[PDB]
Copies of this chain bind each other. A is one copy, B any other.
Amino acid sequence: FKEYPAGEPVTMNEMELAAVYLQPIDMEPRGMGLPAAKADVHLQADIHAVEGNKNGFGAGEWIPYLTISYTLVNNDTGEKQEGTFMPMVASDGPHYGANIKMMGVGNYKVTYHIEPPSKAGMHRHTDSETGVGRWWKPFDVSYEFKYVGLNSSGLVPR
């Protein structure tokens, strides 16, 4: 399937963090979250270790057990939306995301608010023999993108 970048990926805390979006999706269980028919996009956080990660993840590996919320702003209109992502798995692997209703075509800012795996119940080893570095503190990452909508076969008859 096709996916579209929302702004520029960034590196922070030995991870590469990107925002992306695609068409609304269906997830298990049915009836939970915003239904696809009532959404404009599935918004996602793509987060993987980079080389030199000190928390036990190899380059390219997904970072699991994160807690992530977002603040989305249409910069043209001022309209703001807040929400949370869930951990998910799709055909191209695990991610964090949510179906969302957008706030019209325009220039957007999105900020992801990220908390480390300790919060959701992952426990790092801390000893000399098997341990890893301490978790980083919660942080934000921001993205700027132009949203025009997604591809159609035709919105009106031809």
Contacts and interface: CB of A to CB of B under 8 A. Distances in A.
Interface in A1-57: 1-2, 22-23, 25-30, 32-33, 36, 42, 55-57
B64 A123 contact: no
Interface string A72-109: 00000000000000111111111000000000000000
A104 to B, nearest CB: 24
A132 B95 CA distance: 13
Given A1-B129, A64-B64, A87-B121, A93 B56 contact: yes
Contacts of A146: none
A31 to B, nearest CB: 8
Contacts of A127: 25-26, 36
Interface residues of A, number: 44
Nearest to A33: B123
A58 B93 contact: yes
Contact of A122 (B2, B55, B89): B89
A90 B56 contact: yes
B27 A90 contact: no
Sorted nearest first, the 6 A-B pairs with minimum C-beta distance are: A56-B89, A64-B64, A90-B125, A26-B127, A90-B130, A27-B123
A65 interface: yes
A27 B130 CA distance: 10
